[PDB]
Every structure is written in structure tokens, then in C-alpha cells.
């Protein structure tokens, strides 16, 4: 019992727990599992369902474990016959008004209510009266409602208030006819709306896209990561046969506590549409079916003409580390350094890791005292990250925004809307500057918009000036963070997928352009007489402008490496097999390398992973975030002349995400995202 | 976490009394008599995470759980549709054996099994689960604390007003 | 005997795609996949039974909560090719239509016992 | 047209403009209707049957639906809310598809 730790007795066994735990927390620490319906670790305690009742020797009547604070020398009994009888009675009260909808309920194999009825309930009923009836109301395109099945926990209301922060759901009514939902006809607006479906224990809130399609026992679950944004949310993809049926989050306190954004949750719909299955080679009749050998022959004949920087590579949002290292090695062997990323921040320096990663870990932002957001709308860029910023706002952190006025869930101080305001703040003229200096844990978050700006050098220099003046980076705390909107950006920067000195010094009109999943390229990137090779898995703007199309696997179909905005290396698994005559992308690039006459040394996936480890040692440490040495000041001392070269632009710091639901090829193909966009635009 | 105090008692006791003789890695795989190309397949040793729909902790690595939870799983292979009836067809012999029957109490047990048969394996540790509530809502009392809006300002009092 | 999917007297199929009959099938002879219908009902887009894999235990008739699937009284259903013995939703519905009155009488008699 | 349309629900037991839960069956073949996927003929579909049946007036704000006349020879007992229901917009039994509406809420 060192200081904070106390001792508690659970069923006559000694358990050492901190003083701040409740009875339910100590019971979990003791290995005893208490029946719960309304209690949630990450939500406010409610105490309404009364299913957690245990016995305390001091108390005369059973107490609710979730809300009862544990005390020194407390004896906790979870198996006394009175507790069993109370559990059975509470279960009876829960089931008397429940509808007999088990066959038609999409919670049939995954219902807490059924399982706790079987385990902690009687086998028979004594209710013969009329049951309650509720009329369902629309909550939007993604949430289906059967409020008749609703046991009145408050998990959905507590989530909508504390976490989502839209404050749309409430308990309207009194007594038995009390009902849950918007009193008016309203549609749930948060991009974290899907999480209520998982939070709902009894299927009253259900996923409308995943409606009546499968049962839980039919699905094989594979643990992978979400490439929807640079958060790299940990997910579990459930598949029946060759079809992905649904995507649900996994617990990772480091990155996504247990929440998933709606785009990531419901973009599996676009994995069945506009798919590339076979190699396509252009002819007078258009793009036509071709074998792998013929496409490689055409690419060889095209590359023979091009030389040096005439070969150009553009990587996409969903390209993985292995395919990018493959393309880098192939094009360096051919003799090209024109390797760019589609975003528009092509020339961002990859020299020092601290410059382009979130040096404060996502978990450690919890301890922040003052947070500054520069040119970022964290809501659109990463809804779960905005949820965590809401959590720190709840603790009492003061948040300032130096971008455009946006509807962040929490309240914030609008420091300014243009670069000049950030310049003034960095110089030290500001009350918020004195708050950043005063704070023990100051955090500065710079958005991807600043990275995609024509005047990025001087804005980054101003941000570094603010870092040095306010001392956000110190011993034991690095408060400089850069939030990324794309999964492949941090990996591309890490491997060194950056234009070489020659490419920047002497721009050369590209004669052959290689698109590695890039459907968002600016139209000026391809000179319109170039020979375009598109490698990817959906047919989109990239495939339409391709002389050769090479089918590739998607993130659900390949075991690939992605780096987070914090730089944590995470890996995908093959949930479903590859479709048609498609192949893994790094294998495609290596086969093309053999065909063109520059054979790459690696011939297996572990060899590719070893090459990634050689190029960047942190890639060997999958699942662990590696700290960055603070070298940002030396970099800006190095680029003195360049930051002076950078000019001023008549643009205001704002997000580049026009529509959140469609940002990549998978989302654009998705029908569900299109419905969400139509609902928002009406 | 205390004890099952059932047949599992004799199970564990039989475990601790007896032991297996050490053999070189991969030798048992030849004794098994299965095709040797089976051991070319790669192995993932992992514990399933909790399903987000349910709040039970049985499937997780928790002191409550007394069942084997570490699976050996093989990589997924090609699957197609039967031309006549659209059924899912496969040629993978090891499709469901690992998920269904290869359950182990401890990661070292599964690693020992894989090394004994000669399967190359990668062990994935589950993301740690810590049941720690946040400081804002650490307890039920915190819901109705002064933290919500601060201490009530008394400048509205008639004495202070007048 | 031979399986048959049933309809309500209005003409609406009794099946609600609970998928219990597919979960209880000892021989794995039933494959079911469903969707939301345009009206909003929970209906199957596929219900096929392999009669060369069926063991005619009747467990699927026991598990169905709405009496949608029943084993009819017909034992003259031999075929000259194996493909005709892979039934589908349309064939099962036709078999239910053909034997409706006899099945209904048998169910009325059986309801007393269970 | 149907190849790029968003799957929608007519709204008999759902709402007029909601998404329809859809699997990927028939997506390759090119079929996009529920009945088309499993029926290849030109006969009357069971949905056509259920639409033809008309809503039934009841007294009260709740109706007990057993699907069939005998409780043990049909769907499980269901209690349907009659609030906010009229002939044009009736309540529906999820098991059977029968439609109900009542005038009692209007104090009649």
C-alpha cells in the first residue's frame, strides 16, 4: 500500500487499488466481473440501470458498484444469494417491457441483454400485461432507430453531450413513457455519430448501412488499421467470404480510445464499386483488357524514351511504405529524383523528424494546460483527435485558434484568421502568448494546411519563433505538434520520398508519370503529353488519365505499413483476398523493375521490411512511437536564405477539406458517403 | 483471479506434475506426417481484442477470464465464388483450424508449439487495457462538482447588489 | 420430407432472415444472405438448401420462430441430375405453394402437441 | 441509372428518404433490386402481395399483433404504437408486414 494505493477485500481476497477507484473498479481488479448495462469507462457515471448491485458489510442495502466509492477495509460480496436475487429481479424488470424482436434484431448474436439474461436471469416470465410501444424517428442516414427495444440507460445521451458535444439526445418524458431522442425531427450531425451504435447495448440504435445483412457469428474479424486519415485508428474488419461486411474500432488508448469516425466506419461500401481488376493498356479504342506481361512491355517501351528527371512519381493518400520504397528504389535506379506527394506539400523537408510529426504523443496531450491550433480544423481533419481535444478542454485547458472561425465542438478563443495574427503572436504581443508562456505544458498544433501553403517556409519559421519564445519545447515535454490529414505523408517523409536537388533546381517537363494511387493530383502535374502509368485499386481521375492501369490491392487486401501523424508505425492485415488479376503494389513495382532491366535486390516481404528498417530504423519498431531529437532550430538556421526567399500570399489559414465524407477514392466511390453529403447539403 | 476451484484445478495440477522432453525445433513437424509445405505458411500469434458491441471482458486477457485466448492463425489465401451457386470456394486446408481449435493460455505456449512444429511466427501483444477513468469524471460526485461552471458567483445577492 | 418455404395467407413470405436455421443446421446445408427490402422489411436475397447435404433431421423446422421453413410431406422428389437437387429460394417457395394446404393441416394437428 | 443511384427505401416500414441496408449480392451481375436478386421471373412478387393488402382500423393507441389469428401459429406477439398514424401513413408489423392505424390519439 504505497501512499496512494489502498487495500480492499473482494469476496475475502485482498486487492490493492488506488484510492480513487469505485467498487466496480476494484471488483474488476479482483477478477470478478459485475453485470453492467449503463456503466462505461469513458463516459460519466449514471447509476440508473441498477444491475451492478453488490453488498457492503457497512451498508444495509445493496449499493451500485459503478458509483460507490471504495473505502479502506471495505469487504465486497458479489456472490451472496441476496445479490443473485436482486440481479434476477432487475433482469425481470428490464425484460418485462422489452419487445420480442430477437429474430429481427441486428443485435441477436451480440446482445448484452440476452447474455446477461442467460447468465444472471431466470428462465421464465410472469408478465402477462400490455408492453410499452414507441414510435421511431429519423436520426440521419447512418443511424437506424428501434426505440421500443431501448432500456433507459443514458449512454447515447452521455456520449452526445460529453464526447460528441452536439447535445442533441435527451430523455424526454417522465416515468415509463419516458423516451430517448431529439424532441424535434433532427439528424445527428457529429462525425462521431456512429459510435452511439456501438455504445448502445440493446440494439435500439443500429447501423442503417449494415442492416439485416449478416449475423455476428457469421463474420471473421481481422484486426487492422484505418487509413481514412493520419490518426491510424485501430479497427476490426469483419468479413463473410470475400466481402467486408462492417468495420468497428478496437481499443488503443494511445491513439483511438475506442472511437471511430463515421467516414472510416462506413467507407467499406465504396470498396465494392469502381474497382480495378485487370491491367489496362490504352489503344485507339480506349483502355482495354491486357495481361500483366503486355502492360509491363508497354511501360518498358515508354520508359526507354524517357531519361532522368523526365520520369516522375506521384504518391497517393493510401500508398503504403513498401510500395513507396519500391518506387523510390526503382526510379533512383533509372536515374530520377522527381518523387513528389500529391498533397501539394511536395517540397516539405524530410530532414528532421521533429519537424513533421506530433512530438507530443496523442496520449500525452491529455496533460496539456494550454493548446494553440494554427491553421487547422481538427474536426474535419481527425474527429477522434477533436474528441480528445474536447476531453482536455473539459479538464480546463485553454484553447486558441489562429485560423478561420470554425465550429469546433468546444469553445475557443479566436486569436486571428490570417498569417499576420500569428506573426504578432510569435513576436510576444498577446494575452494568449502570456498564457502559453505561463502554462507548464503548452501544446502548439500546426495543421496540414500550413504544410500545403506556397509561403510555408516563413510561416514555419514564425511557428518556430513562437516555440522558442514561449518555450513549448523543454526538458521532459515537447509541445510542438503537426497534424496530418493523410496516412502516406509521414511514411513518405520518413523514407525520403522527396524531390532531389536537381529536380527542384531545374524543373524538367515530365515525359512519363507514375501515379501510385494518386487520384487528387493537380492538373498541372502531368504535362498532358506525358505517358501516365496509374497503379491503384479504384477507377477515378487518376485511372481516367492513364495509358496503362495496373490493378493493386486495397488496405483491406494487403499487409502494409503506415505511419501516423505521431509517427507510430502500424501494420495492416489481409482481411479479404485480392480481387481479379490484381497484385500487391510492392510486388508490382519489383516485377516492373525486373522487366525494365533494373532488378531490385529484395524478393520477399521480410526483405522489404528490412530495407525499410535500413532506410529508417523506427520502421523496425512496429507499434511503438519513437521520440524525435529536437533538431528543428538547427534546420531553420540551415534554411535561412530559403525562408527569406519565400514570399507572402493573399490567403488565410484554413482547412483544405471541403467535404469531410469524400476525401479519397474509396470515399468517393462509397454510396453511403454520398447520402451523408446530400443530407448535409440540403 | 483467485481460483476456479473446479476441474481446472486438476487440469493445472496435471500440467505442473508432467513435462515434455526437449527436441530440436522442427523435428516434430516431420513426425506429424502432414505435407511439408504446410510449414511454409506464416503464423500470427495474437489475442483477440474485445468486440466493440459488447462490454463483457471474458474474451479479453482479464483476470476474470480462465479460458485459453491466444490463437495461432495463418494468413488468408484466395477465395472465389462457385459459378453454379455462388458459394464461397477455397483451396486452403488450414483455413479454419487455427481460429477454431488452436487456443493457448500463454504466449510462450503458442510460441513453443510453433517452434516445435517449425512454423515461423510473429507474436502480437494486445493493446493494454487499463480501467482508469478520466479526472473530469473520476467519480459520481464529479458530475455535480463546481468544475462544471466554477464556484457560484455571489454578486447577484440582494445584499451585494444593494 | 422435402423442404418448403411458406407464405402468409396475404402472400407475404414468413421468413424474417433470423438465420437461426442456418446456425442450427448440423450438416451446413443452408446458406442465407439477406438485406433490407425497399418497403423496409427484413427479407432474404438468398435462401438455398443443399438436398444432397441435408440429413432431414428437422432441426431447421424446430429453430424457425415464425414457421417459415417446414419439411413437407413429399418424398417423391428424386432427380436425374445433381444440379436439380440444389434448391434455391424460388424453388422452395414454389414447393411451399404446391403443398400449402397439407402443410397447414399438419401444423394445425401438431400445434396441440407442440 | 440504377447503377449510380443511391440505394433507397420506399418507406412502408421505414422512412421515405433513408438508406437501404444492402449487401454486395448481385452487384457484379448488375441487379440492384431486392426481388430481382432472388426471383428471375416476371410474376407477382410477395412485396406486391403485401402492398395490395390494406391498412386495418383498430381502437386504442396500441395493437397486439400475433401475425396470424392463433397466437401459437404465427409471429411472436408484438405491440405497435398507433400514435401519429393515419390511413396514408400506417404503422407496420415488422414480422408480418400488416398495416394498422388508429384515430384515438386525436381524441376520437
Amino acid at each position: 500500500l504505497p501512499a496512494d494505493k489502498m487495500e480492499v477485500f473482494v469476496n475475502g481476497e485482498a486487492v490493492v487499488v488506488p484510492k480513487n477507484f469505485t467498487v466496480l473498479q476494484a471488483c474488476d481488479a479482483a477478477g470478478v466481473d459485475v453485470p453492467r448495462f449503463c456503466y462505461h469507462q469513458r463516459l460519466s457515471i449514471a447509476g440508473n440501470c441498477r444491475m451492478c448491485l453488490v453488498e457492503i458489510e457497512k451498508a444495509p442495502k445493496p449499493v451500485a458498484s459503478c458509483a460507490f466509492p471504495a473505502g479502506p477495509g471495505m469487504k465486497i460480496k458479489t456472490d451472496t444469494p441476496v445479490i443473485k436475487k436482486a440481479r434476477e429481479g432487475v433482469m425481470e424488470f428490464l425484460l418485462i417491457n422489452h419487445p420480442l424482436d430477437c429474430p429481427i434484431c441486428d443485435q441477436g448474436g451480440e446482445c448484452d441483454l440476452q447474455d446477461q439474461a442467460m447468465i444472471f436471469g431466470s428462465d421464465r416470465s410472469r408478465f402477462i400485461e400490455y408492453k410499452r410501444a414507441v414510435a421511431d424517428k429519423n436520426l440521419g442516414p447512418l443511424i437506424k432507430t428501434s426505440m421500443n427495444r431501448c432500456i433507459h440507460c443514458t449512454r447515447c445521451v452521455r456520449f452526445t453531450h460529453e464526447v460528441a458535444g452536439t447535445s442533441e439526445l435527451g430523455i424526454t418524458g417522465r416515468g415509463r413513457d419516458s423516451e430517448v431522442g431529439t424532441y424535434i425531427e433532427k439528424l445527428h450531425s457529429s462525425e462521431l455519430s456512429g459510435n452511439v451504435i456501438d455504445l448502445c447495448p440493446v440494439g435500439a440504435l443500429l447501423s442503417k448501412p449494415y442492416a439485416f445483412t449478416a449475423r455476428s457469428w457469421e463474420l471473421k474479424g481481422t484486426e487492422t488499421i484505418d487509413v481514412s486519415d493520419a490518426l491510424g485508428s485501430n479497427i476490426k474488419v469483419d468479413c463473410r467470404g470475400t466481402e467486408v461486411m462492417r468495420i468497428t474500432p478496437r481499443l488503443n488508448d494511445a491513439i483511438n480510445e475506442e472511437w471511430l469516425s463515421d467516414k472510416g466506419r462506413f467507407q467499406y461500401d465504396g470498396l465494392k464499386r469502381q474497382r480495378l481488376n485487370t491491367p489496362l493498356v490504352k489503344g485507339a479504342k480506349g483502355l482495354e483488357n491486357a495481361t500483366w506481361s503486355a502492360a509491363f512491355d508497354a511501360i518498358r517501351t515508354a520508359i526507354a524514351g524517357a531519361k532522368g528527371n523526365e520520369l516522375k512519381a506521384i504518391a497517393g493518400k493510401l500508398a503504403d511504405a513498401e510500395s513507396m520504397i519500391a518506387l523510390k528504389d526503382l526510379f533512383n535506379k533509372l536515374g530520377s529524383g522527381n518523387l513528389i506527394h500529391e498533397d501539394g506539400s511536395a517540397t516539405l523537408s524530410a530532414d528532421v523528424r521533429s519537424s513533421y510529426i506530433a512530438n507530443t504523443t496523442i496520449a500525452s496531450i491529455e496533460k496539456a494546460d494550454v493548446i494553440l491550433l494554427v491553421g487547422t480544423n481538427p474536426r474535419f481533419e481527425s474527429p477522434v483527435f477533436n474528441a480528445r481535444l474536447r476531453k482536455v478542454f473539459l479538464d480546463g485547458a485553454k484553447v486558441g485558434l489562429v485560423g478561420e472561425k470554425v465550429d469546433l465542438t468546444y469553445a475557443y478563443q479566436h486569436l486571428g484568421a490570417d498569417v499576420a495574427a500569428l506573426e504578432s503572436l510569435a513576436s510576444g504581443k498577446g494575452a494568449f502568448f502570456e498564457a502559453l508562456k505561463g502554462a507548464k505544458n503548452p501544446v502548439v498544433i500546426v495543421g496540414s494546411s500550413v504544410l500545403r501553403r506556397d509561403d510555408r517556409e516563413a510561416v514555419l519559421k514564425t511557428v518556430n519563433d513562437l516555440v522558442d519564445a514561449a518555450g513549448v519545447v523543454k526538458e521532459g515535454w515537447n509541445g510542438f505538434n503537426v497534424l496530418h490529414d493523410n496516412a502516406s505523408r509521414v511514411a513518405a517523409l520518413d523514407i525520403g520520398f522527396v524531390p532531389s536537388a536537381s529536380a527542384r533546381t531545374n524543373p524538367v517537363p515530365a515525359k512519363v508519370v507514375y501515379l501510385l494511387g494518386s487520384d487528387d493530383f493537380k492538373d498541372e502535374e502531368i504535362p498532358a503529353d506525358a505517358f501516365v502509368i496509374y497503379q491503384g485499386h479504384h477507377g477515378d481521375k487518376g485511372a481516367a488519365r492513364a495509358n496503362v492501369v495496373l490493378p493493386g490491392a486495397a488496405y483491406t487486401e494487403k499487409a502494409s505499413l503506415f505511419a501516423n501523424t505521431e509517427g507510430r508505425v502500424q501494420t495492416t492485415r489481409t482481411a479479404v483476398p485480392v480481387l481479379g488479376d490484381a497484385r500487391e503494389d510492392w510486388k508490382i513495382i519489383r516485377a516492373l523493375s525486373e522487366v525494365v532491366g533494373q532488378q531490385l535486390p529484395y524478393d520477399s516481404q521480410p526483405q522489404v521490411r528490412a530495407r525499410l528498417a535500413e532506410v529508417a530504423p523506427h520502421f523496425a519498431e512496429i507499434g511503438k512511437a519513437e521520440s524525435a531529437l529536437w533538431l528543428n532550430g538547427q534546420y531553420f538556421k540551415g534554411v535561412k536564405d530559403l525562408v527569406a526567399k519565400a514570399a507572402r500570399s493573399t490567403a488565410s489559414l484554413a482547412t483544405n477539406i471541403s467535404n469531410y465524407y469524400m476525401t479519397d477514392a474509396i470515399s468517393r466511390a462509397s454510396r453511403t458517403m454520398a447520402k451523408c453529403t446530400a443530407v448535409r447539403q440540403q | 483471479a483467485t481460483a476456479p476451484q473446479d476441474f481446472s484445478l486438476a487440469m493445472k495440477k496435471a500440467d505442473e506434475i508432467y513435462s515434455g522432453k526437449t527436441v530440436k525445433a522442427g523435428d516434430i513437424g516431420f513426425s506429424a506426417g502432414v505435407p511439408l509445405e504446410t510449414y511454409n505458411r506464416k503464423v500470427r500469434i495474437f489475442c483477440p481484442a474485445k468486440a466493440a458491441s459488447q462490454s463483457g471482458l471474458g474474451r479479453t486477457l482479464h483476470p476474470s477470464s480462465k479460458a485459453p485466448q491466444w490463437k495461432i492463425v495463418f494468413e488468408n489465401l484466395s477465395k472465389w465464388e462457385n459459378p453454379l451457386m455462388g458459394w464461397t470456394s477455397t483451396a486452403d486446408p488450414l483455413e479454419n483450424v487455427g481460429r477454431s481449435t488452436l487456443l493457448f493460455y500463454t504466449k510462450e505456449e503458442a510460441a513453443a508449439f510453433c517452434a516445435k512444429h517449425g512454423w515461423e511466427y510473429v507474436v502480437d501483444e494486445p493493446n493494454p487495457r487499463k480501467h482508469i477513468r478520466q479526472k473530469r469524471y473520476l467519480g459520481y460526485g464529479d458530475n455535480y462538482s463546481i468544475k462544471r461552471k466554477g464556484v457560484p458567483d455571489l454578486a447577484h445577492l440582494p445584499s451585494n447588489r444593494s | 420430407g422435402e423442404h418448403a418455404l411458406r407464405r402468409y395467407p396475404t402472400g407475404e413470405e414468413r421468413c424474417i432472415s433470423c438465420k437461426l436455421c442456418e446456425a442450427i443446421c448440423p450438416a451446413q446445408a443452408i446458406t442465407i444472405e439477406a438485406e433490407e427490402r425497399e418497403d423496409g422489411s427484413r427479407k432474404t436475397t438468398r435462401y438455398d438448401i443443399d438436398m444432397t447435404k441435408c440429413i432431414y433431421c428437422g432441426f431447421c423446422q424446430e429453430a424457425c420462430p415464425v414457421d417459415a421453413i417446414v419439411e413437407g410431406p413429399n418424398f417423391e422428389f428424386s432427380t436425374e441430375t445433381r444440379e436439380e437437387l440444389l434448391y434455391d429460394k424460388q424453388k422452395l417457395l414454389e414447393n411451399g405453394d404446391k403443398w400449402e394446404q397439407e402443410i397447414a393441416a399438419n401444423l394445425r394437428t401438431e400445434s396441440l402437441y407442440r | 441509372a440504377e447503377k449510380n443511384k443511391i440505394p433507397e427505401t420506399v418507406g412502408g416500414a421505414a422512412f421515405k428518404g433513408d438508406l437501404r441496408g444492402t449487401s454486395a449480392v448481385g452487384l457484379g451481375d448488375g441487379l440492384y433490386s431486392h426481388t430481382s436478386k432472388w426471383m428471375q421471373g416476371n410474376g407477382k412478387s410477395p412485396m406486391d402481395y403485401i402492398n395490395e393488402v390494406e391498412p386495418i382500423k383498430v381502437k386504442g393507441l396500441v395493437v397486439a399483433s400475433h401475425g396470424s389469428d392463433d397466437p401459437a401459429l404465427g409471429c411472436p406477439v408484438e405491440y405497435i404504437s398507433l400514435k401519429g398514424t393515419s390511413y396514408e401513413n400506417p404503422a407496420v408489423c415488422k414480422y408480418t408486414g400488416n398495416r394498422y392505424y388508429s384515430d384515438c390519439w386525436k381524441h376520437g
Binding site: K272, L276, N277, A284 | E81, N82, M85 | L86 | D29
Partner: peptide
């Protein structure tokens, strides 16, 4: 010769039970 599965050669509209829609390249 009345009943055959929908994937049969005899079926008027034979079914390839593919669960993915494939991109159609633009004309010319």
C-alpha cells in the same frame, strides 16, 4: 428439364456471382 440453378448454362440470364462492381473505362 424444368428447374436448374441460376448459374446454369441453361438459365436465360446466367449469373456470375461476383460481389464487386468493376470500373468501366471511358470511351475512346
Amino acid at each position: 428439364e424444368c428447374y436448374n440453378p441460376k448459374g446454369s448454362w441453361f438459365n436465360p440470364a446466367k449469373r456470375n456471382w461476383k460481389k464487386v462492381e468493376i470500373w468501366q473505362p471511358p470511351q475512346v
